[PDB]
From a paper:
Depending on the biotinylated metallocofactor, the assembled ArMs exhibit a diverse range of activities. Herein, we report on an artificial nickel chlorinase (ANCase) for the C(sp3)–H chlorination of alkanes, taking advantage of the biotin-Sav technology, Scheme 1c. The pronounced affinity of biotin for Sav ensures the tight binding of a biotinylated metallocofactor to the Sav scaffold.
Additionally, we converted the original dimethyl group to a cyclohexyl entity to minimize the influence on the dihedral angle between the two amido-quinoline planes. Accordingly, the cofactor [(BiotC4-bAQ)Ni] 1 was synthesized, see, Scheme S1 (ESI†). For this purpose, we assessed the quantitative anchoring of the [(BiotC4-bAQ)Ni] 1 into Sav WT by a HABA displacement titration using CD spectroscopy as readout. The determined dissociation constant was Kd = 0.29 ± 0.05 μM (see ESI†). Based on the collected datasets, it is apparent that the [(BiotC4-bAQ)Ni] 1 lies close to residues N49, S112, K121, L124 as well as K121′ from the adjacent monomer. Residue N49 establishes hydrogen bonding interaction with the cyclohexyl amine moiety of the cofactor [(BiotC4-bAQ)Ni] 1. Based on the structural information, we performed genetic optimization of [(BiotC4-bAQ)Ni] 1·Sav WT targeting positions Sav S112 and K121.
Author numbering:
A (entry chain C), D (entry chain B): 10 to 135
B (entry chain D), C (entry chain A): 10 to 134
Amino acid sequence: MGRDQAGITGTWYNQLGSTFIVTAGADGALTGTYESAVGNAESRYVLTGRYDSAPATDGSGTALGWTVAWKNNYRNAHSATTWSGQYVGGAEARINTQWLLTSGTTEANAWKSTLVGHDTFTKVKP
Amino acid sequence: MGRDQAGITGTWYNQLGSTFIVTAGADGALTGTYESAVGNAESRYVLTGRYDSAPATDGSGTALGWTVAWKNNYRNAHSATTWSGQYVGGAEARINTQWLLTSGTTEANAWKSTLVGHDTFTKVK
Amino acid sequence: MGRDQAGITGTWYNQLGSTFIVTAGADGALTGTYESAVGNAESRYVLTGRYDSAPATDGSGTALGWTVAWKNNYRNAHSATTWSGQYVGGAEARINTQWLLTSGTTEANAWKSTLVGHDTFTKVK
Amino acid sequence: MGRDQAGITGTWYNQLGSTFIVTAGADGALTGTYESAVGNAESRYVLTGRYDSAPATDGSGTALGWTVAWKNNYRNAHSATTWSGQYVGGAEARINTQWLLTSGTTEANAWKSTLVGHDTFTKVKP
Ligand SMILES: O=C1N[C@H]2[C@H](CS[C@H]2CCCCNC2CCC(C(=O)Nc3cccc4cccnc34)(C(=O)Nc3cccc4cccnc34)CC2)N1
Ligand SMILES: O=C1N[C@H]2[C@H](CS[C@H]2CCCCNC2CCC(C(=O)Nc3cccc4cccnc34)(C(=O)Nc3cccc4cccnc34)CC2)N1
Ligand SMILES: O=C1N[C@H]2[C@H](CS[C@H]2CCCCNC2CCC(C(=O)Nc3cccc4cccnc34)(C(=O)Nc3cccc4cccnc34)CC2)N1
Ligand code: NI
Ligand code: NI
Ligand code: NI
């Protein structure tokens, strides 16, 4: 039912070599796994998110976001990343994102809790 | 059972008057609803996220994040916010966050697609 | 002269205990020194920036920003912070900011080069 | 002189087609002009900033940042952008940045005051 449900669902790769496997639901849900090529991370991590299942009709992208907490059956980095961005369809579909990575900190170190960055995902590895 | 499952589960209010109702699952899931006091938003929106269910024991906070897409059965703002932050428990429990709000845009307007801000959530209004 | 030249010029303090000493010029310049209470920083660092010297008259704040490179005669942290925000006048004047701290990194580590945060500066603290 | 004073100094273009003309001083200063290809912007705006004039020698980039207030003799957008990033010298020199654009707002609209994005600058015009 989602306008971009079929386009979003599948396997995506970012510029770092990370792998993002996602199913878009008709209700706006995103569910899948994330494997990071960098950082204190090994194997797949659960991800969950949301996307706009009825986007604008003027050629705009489709807003979405998702979260990974960096704990799985191998490691725990005591941190979580959220990606905020939009899906852009067409011949070379892309999910363009900016992200925030927060680590658990003491109060004294809270000022340095959060990294910001940007990831671009494609359906073919770069 | 997640270490902070009981502390996170419940209702949170930010500095703007928005309301965040969340259930923390034993496996690290966050599920619930968000009601925003500002912006193109009315009634409740679905939220989903994750939290660290086995955090450090050194006094550090508990890392977490969640997403809301601003579409429900009443409105659609063609946008989505992600909050990234940490839960700090105790008498004056807090969830301290930074957030990214992306709107769907044309490619030419993508440079102005994403707002950044910070929200602090407490257990009282 | 700048509309908020006199209001911005002076000594400001943020929530961490850092001190921001600034002169606003009639031409939109910001020039001064920054002393950070946290991080790889000791004593004062040069700052430079810009502000809107003819802001809106509808009660809106005054947009501004400035940079500190964390090198002085005593230390070098191989990093730089930019604060982006707005000055809000009145009995309880504030400069509300969000900031980006970038450290020099190898290309392999570029994904972790930049912190984001927020500081609120007041004239009393 | 700064290690990268000669390398940073010059004319740069980002992926939007904006033009960044900058002079790096031996004292860590950045001065120059910015012309944006997008937004409420016309002609050149004053910029000022700072860079690390004695960076690490381990292959790391050179940290820097600069500000533009979007007021000149032609327009006033009641806004300011700060770019935070690092200069990477060598083959295909690049300045990689993330930026924050804050507009003056009323207190009720302060939550919507700030955009975030990322710009990459090279000396080759797109
Ligand atoms: O595809 C992809 N992959 C990437 C992108 C986006 S997700 C990303 C993959 C993430 C996989 C998990 N990577 C771990 C993160 C936590 C870690 C670390 O290196 N943290 C940090 C390093 C440098 C700067 C930081 C600033 C703020 C906070 N963290 C920063 C760490 O231990 N942090 C800390 C431990 C203990 C105390 C801390 C106190 C303050 C801050 N951090 C602390 C170890 C590596 N896209
Ligand atoms: O008033 C105030 N005060 C505060 C606020 C806003 S300004 C702030 C005061 C700043 C004073 C300078 N503080 C130094 C920063 C550089 C330092 C460090 O701790 N860096 C980092 C720590 C944690 C997370 C990081 C994420 C990304 C990158 N850095 C993070 C460091 O050595 N970093 C690094 C060294 C070598 C290689 C690196 C590779 C990647 C990242 N960092 C590297 C040492 C402390 N408001
Ligand atoms: O090279 C390059 N170029 C680009 C990049 C990085 S710099 C960039 C060039 C910038 C040149 C100036 N462009 C003006 C900015 C202000 C403007 C606008 O579109 N603002 C905004 C549009 C969309 C989202 C916003 C979110 C938050 C705030 N602004 C957003 C505007 O009028 N904003 C406002 C006016 C009145 C009230 C406001 C209240 C809240 C927020 N904004 C308000 C008009 C265009 N790299
Ligand atoms: Ni960390
Ligand atoms: Ni650092
Ligand atoms: Ni604006």
